[PDB]
Each structure stands twice: as C-alpha cells, then as structure tokens.
Amino acid sequence: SKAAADDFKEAFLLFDRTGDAKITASQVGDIARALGQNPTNAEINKILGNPSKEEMNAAAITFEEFLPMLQAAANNKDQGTFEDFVEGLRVFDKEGNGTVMGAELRHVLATLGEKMTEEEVEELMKGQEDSNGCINYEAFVKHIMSV
Amino acid sequence: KLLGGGDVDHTQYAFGHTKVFFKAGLLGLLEEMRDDKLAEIITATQARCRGFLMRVEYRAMVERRESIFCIQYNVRSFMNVKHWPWMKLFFKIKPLLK
Amino acid sequence: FDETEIEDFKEAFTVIDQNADGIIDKDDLRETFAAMGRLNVKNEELDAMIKEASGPINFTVFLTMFGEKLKGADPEDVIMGAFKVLDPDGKGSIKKSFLEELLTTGGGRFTPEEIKNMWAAFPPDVAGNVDYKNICYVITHGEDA
Amino acid sequence: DAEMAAFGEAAPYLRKSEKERIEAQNKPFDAKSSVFVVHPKQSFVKGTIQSKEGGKVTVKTEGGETLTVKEDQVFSMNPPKYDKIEDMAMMTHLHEPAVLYNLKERYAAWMIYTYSGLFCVTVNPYKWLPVYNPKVVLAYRGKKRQEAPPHIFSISDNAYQFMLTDRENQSILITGESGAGKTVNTKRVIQYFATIAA
C-alpha cells in the first residue's frame, strides 16, 4: 500500500542477477519468503498454474506481476500460529520435556510432505541440537521464528 | 520404528506378531481431514523454515564476500609473477635471509 | 603489505644492491646474477628490468613496482586460513571437483579454463584440491620446492 | 534361500525361491480394475472390470467371458504383494474369494500349509512329499511361526515351547471332513512329540 514499502523493489534488485529488473518465476517462492512471507511450496505452485503460468519453461519477470503476487500471498500469513508448531512437536515425543531425538526430526523434515533437502535440515539443527542427540524444540522453534 | 515419523494418527494402527493392523474407513476419514490440516499447519511451517534457511545463506554469502577476493586476486598475482626473473630471484634468495 | 614482508623486500634489496648506496643499477643486477651462478646473463634482461621503472631503483621504487605486480599477493597464513574454512573439520585435503565447482560458482575468477591452468603446474593434489599447503607455499614463493 | 537349508529338499514345498517371490510381488497391478467376481458355474472367478452400470458391473474373465453382475457380486483383489501369503489374515482384503484363491494358488505350487489366522490350514496332497522329512522335524525345532514357513510342526513345536514357557497345558484341535486326512496329521503330530522329547 506503501504504507508504500519501496524496499521490496530494492530487494528485487538484489535477487535479479542480470540487472534488467526482472526475476524468474523459480525465484519468486524464495523471495516471498525473504520479504517476510511463508507460502507453502504447493501454494506457490498452484497459484502459478492457476494463472496458466508454467514454471517448467523459461520465465522472466516484471515487478508489476511480482508485487501483486506478494500481496496475494500476504493474506495467508494468518496461518503462522506458533501454538500449533510447538504442539505438533510436543505430540511427536513422549514425556514432559520438549526434546526430539535427532534423526526423528531430520528424517521427517526431509521425507514428510514438502521435501526439505538434508543439507537444509542439517543447517536448521546446527547449534540447537547438542551431542546428546536431543533437540529442544522450545528453543528450536523460538530460533526458527527469529528469522 | 518406521511409523515413528509422519503427521499420522498413531492410534489408527496396531501391531502384532505377524503384522500391523490399520483402520480405513472412518478413522480413515478422520486422518484425511487431519492430513489436510497439517499441510496448512505444515505447509506454513515449512515455508518459514525454507525462508529462514536461505536467510542464513545470505549471511554467509556476504561474509565470504571479501575472503574470496582475497583469494581471487591473490592467486592471479602468482600466475603472473612466478614467470618473472626478479621474482624467481627473490625466490632462490628468500632463504639465505633471516 | 605487512611489515615483515616489507623487511623481506628490504633484505632482498640489500642483497641485489651490492654497492650499498640505496639504488640498484644495472651493474648490481648483473653482479647479483653472477653471484647466483648466471655467467651468461644478457644486458637485455637487465635493461628489461630497468624498463619496468620510470626512475632509478631505490627502495620505494622497488616497493611500488612489486606492489603493482602483487596486487593480490596473499601470505601463507591467510591462504591456509581460507583453506581451513574450506576444510572446516581439519586435516583433510579437499576434493578436486569441490574446488572446481566452488571457484566457478561463486566467482568469475574461479571460471573453468583458469582451473585447468591451476591444475597445470600446481600439480594433481594441489590442482585436485586434495592436498593443501604446498600451493600456499608456491604462491608466496614460486617454483617447485 | 540362505536360511533354507535345514529343509533344503523340502523347501520348495514350504517356501519359494527368493525371486519366484520377487518376480511375483513385484509385478504390474491395476487395482481399480482388477477384481474377483461371482459366477454361476464356477464359484468365483477373476476378471477385469470393463464398465459400470451405476450399480451393475460388467466384467471380463480369465478364460474370456463377460458378465454383468451386481455391485456386490464384485470383490476387490489383493495387490500382488500378497501372492501366496503364509497368513491370509495379513491380507488387506478379507473376502470370501481371496481366501479361496490364496489357498488354491499355493497348492498349485504344492504348498499344503497355509495359515489363516490362528489356524493351520492343510490341504490333502494326494501324492508324496518330503515334508514329513526327518530333516524338517529338526528345522521346526525351537522356532516361532514367524521364523519359519507354514507347517504343522510349527504348531506342534510351539505348543511344546509354550508348554514349558508359560507352564500351561496345551491342545491341538484337528478337524475336517471324512476325506480331509486328519488321522494322518494326528499321527504325524504325535510322532513329533515322541521324537522331540523322548
């Protein structure tokens, strides 16, 4: 709205590697996340196809399409409730203390639903899981929602 | 051990000596609804992660910024120099020094 | 330029300036080469070294000429710093294909053709990216050790 | 394969080669179309669903026949993963046909012992088999029924086991029609006891 945030246009100049002021359709998922929006990858996929937009063939962009797609994704930020994120992992391990065994969270984050690479899974556990093999998800989900 | 993972109803099944037992078709129905409900819950929780994941990549890319250059230029020198009389000289000579 | 590297160039300037007056002339170049074993050093080689300067080779003219040729010169401790960050678990020499991919995909200075020239006198291990350390030696002091 | 040695010679009548299996479980399957169906002459034969009359069904046959039968004259067919299942009760398709069919298939392959829950189904070979083989007897000795293929000595040994393990008495109930050949089993069970604990 501007509140006209012109820093979204300045961040589009940091993600366009050619400097022509266009951003390919394959970068739009990760740049919506870097502007403070977490649409799921199936949602980013649907919307695209919904608009008869094929992410399979070469794509370019213009700021005039990327701005309204970020504004259509911005209504879905009401789905980011931290009660359900901590209660999900609280149902994932027994006893009254928030600890996932290391390999349980790593294999679930790579193979269940939207596949996260094991390189990204190791980069998200690095520091929050110590050598006991127990990830405290009270501080883990706190630090994941700090970015 | 496998069933350890998944955002699945750990109820709906039951194990025994030769096999597991599984519901469908109601409990089957339940789960399904549930399934969608995690994509939500999940799909949204994935994103941030994804987001966040790359957000750390930028902090690294950036750090790296110069250490590369340093490495970059630094090599180039050598490729040029190593063939220079004066530099070979310095080289054989560099040792006699203290 | 760190100060010990500038003191190394001051010691090399004193070993080539055998008249000890502070200016390396063509006679100093020829008598330093003859004391290293070069009995056949041509006058055209001495004239090509003097043709790289606009004036007499005093200590600051020798430092500015070496500065302008070594604008990416890196000491061995900072090259081993960067190679310890590339091998952050320590000890192991890093893979050949990992250094080829990371040189190219990060920077234009790491483009391939240049990577074939890196493997070409920096031998296999060095080229490959497995050993480590011998390349830091030959980047600070050239030729085979 | 590796396991089977004890039997070795009997093996083929107890279990199938590890690829015979593999070649059977890992094969093409079309669930939505493949089915079992009612049949006026033969009880239940298999077929492929052709069309759908809204509550009638037309199916091709395995022999080549086309019948339009009710919706509930039609029964699903287990994925190939359940070919000659040791325990039909592990099937995900608890029908009438699937049971008939499982027994039948592992018989045409000369396997007379197939379990159906707790039961130990036994089919009259009508010929001779290395099953009562003096090697087998040992083989089945000290083995839970999950450590070995469907067989009577399984039942018979487990009883024994269980007997000493739980400190409870046991029983074996053999039953079938006049020609099913129970005496034979009964006797055979008996020898078993006598041997393994005399």
Swiss-Prot record, chain A:
The keyword ATP-binding does not apply. One of its GO terms (cellular component) is contractile muscle fiber. Residues 7-38, 41-76, 80-115, 115-147 form the EF-hand domain. The keyword Nucleotidyltransferase does not apply. PROSITE patterns: EF_HAND_2. GO terms for molecular function: calcium ion binding. Keywords: Motor protein, Muscle protein, Myosin, Repeat. PANTHER family: MYOSIN LIGHT CHAIN 1, 3, MYOSIN LIGHT CHAIN 1_3, SKELETAL MUSCLE ISOFORM. This is Myosin light chain 3, skeletal muscle isoform.
UniProtKB/Swiss-Prot annotation, chain B:
It is found in: Cytoplasm, Myofibril. Residues 93-95 are annotated as: Hinge. It comes from the Eukaryota. The modification Pros-methylhistidine is found at residue 10. Residues 38-67 form the IQ domain. Residues 14-28 are annotated as: Actin-binding. Muscle contraction. Myosin is a protein that binds to F-actin and has ATPase activity that is activated by F-actin. The rodlike tail sequence is highly repetitive, showing cycles of a 28-residue repeat pattern composed of 4 heptapeptides, characteristic for alpha-helical coiled coils. Muscle myosin is a hexameric protein that consists of 2 heavy chain subunits (MHC), 2 alkali light chain subunits (MLC) and 2 regulatory light chain subunits (MLC-2). Belongs to the TRAFAC class myosin-kinesin ATPase superfamily. Myosin family. This is Myosin heavy chain, skeletal muscle, adult. The lineage of its organism: Eukaryota, Metazoa, Chordata, Craniata, Vertebrata.
Curated annotation (Swiss-Prot), chain C:
Changing residue 83 to L: Results in 50% reduction in actin filament velocity. The gene is MYL11. It comes from the Eukaryota. Myosin regulatory subunit that plays an essential to maintain muscle integrity during early development. Plays a role in muscle contraction. The N-terminus is blocked. N,N,N-trimethylalanine, found in other myosin light chains would not have been detected in the N-terminal tryptic peptide in PubMed:7358336 because it would remain trimethylated and ninhydrin negative after hydrolysis. Ca(2+) binds at residues 17, 19, 21, 28. Residues 9-39, 74-109, 110-144 form the EF-hand domain. Keywords: Calcium, Metal-binding, Methylation, Motor protein, Muscle protein, Myosin, Phosphoprotein, Repeat. The chain holds residues 29 to 164 of 168 of the full protein. GO terms for molecular function: calcium ion binding. Myosin is a hexamer of 2 heavy chains and 4 light chains. This chain binds calcium. The keyword Calcium applies. One of its GO terms (biological process) is skeletal muscle tissue development. GO terms for cellular component: cytoplasm; myosin complex. This is Myosin regulatory light chain 11.
